[PDB]
Amino acid sequence: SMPFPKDCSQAMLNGDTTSGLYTIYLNGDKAQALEVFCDMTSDGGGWIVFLRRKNGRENFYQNWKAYAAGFGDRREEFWLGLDNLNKITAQGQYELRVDLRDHGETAFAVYDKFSVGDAKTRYKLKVEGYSGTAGDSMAYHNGRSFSTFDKNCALSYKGAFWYRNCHRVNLMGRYGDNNHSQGVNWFHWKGHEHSIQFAEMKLRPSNFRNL
Ligand SMILES: CN1CCN(c2ccc(C#N)cc2)CC1
Numbered sequence: 001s002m003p004f005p006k007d008c009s010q011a012m013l014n015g016d017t018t019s020g021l022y023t024i025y026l027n028g029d030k031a032q033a034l035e036v037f038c039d040m041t042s043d044g045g046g047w048i049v050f051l052r053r054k055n056g057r058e059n060f061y062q063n064w065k066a067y068a069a070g071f072g073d074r075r076e077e078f079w080l081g082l083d084n085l086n087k088i089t090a091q092g093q094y095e096l097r098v099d100l101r102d103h104g105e106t107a108f109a110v111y112d113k114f115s116v117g118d119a120k121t122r123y124k125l126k127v128e129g130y131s132g133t134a135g136d137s138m139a140y141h142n143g144r145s146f147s148t149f150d151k152n153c154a155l156s157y158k159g160a161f162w163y164r165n166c167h168r169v170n171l172m173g174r175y176g177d178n179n180h181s182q183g184v185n186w187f188h189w190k191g192h193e194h195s196i197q198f199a200e201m202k203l204r205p206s207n208f209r210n211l
Helices: 008-013 064-069 082-089 153-157 206-210
Strands: 020-025 033-039 047-053 094-102 105-116 125-132 198-205
Touching: 008 020, 008 033, 008 198, 047 082, 064 082, 082 105, 082 198, 094 125, 094 206, 198 206
Parallel strands: none
Antiparallel strands: 020 033, 033 047, 047 198, 094 105, 094 198, 105 125
């Protein structure tokens, strides 16, 4: 086992094969402990989950400080935090996976390169290298800064995202809201008038597939 695993891929190779809560350590530093939810089953496991939508119990219409810090219940609906995502994605080359499920139908998207810049970049999104079945709805968002109502698409759609003008992905939108562009949308799968029941966004090293 590694003493201070820096992501859920290092925590998994530590033999731990059950999805659930694990401690990771940013940059392998014992003074930068972070509790994460690890999806250890989807496409080989080792994924830090950073967004989960599943039931509408948690409020995603939150401010900049909340999106920077994270909020919610790791075991249920939550957001890991943009500062966490910046620090994790700075550790190496990470890949993004999005898992979607709605009335029994599933789809996914993988982006071979995924990074989130630091606060001085307003947490700029990089997503490149699409594969999957959900349709490439993040391409529209590539290179965009993060937006909350207090730093306007976030206001207009009562969500938060790497908005442009405004979105093809709105996974921090209003739960069960099928009104145009208001809900948990992935446009190139289910359009703007269908709020998706279940969504996860997760990350792991891109080289995990052959390490
Ligand atoms: C006021 N606090 C409430 C709980 N918060 C978090 C942070 C990250 C995750 C994850 N993963 C879940 C909850 C941090 C801020």
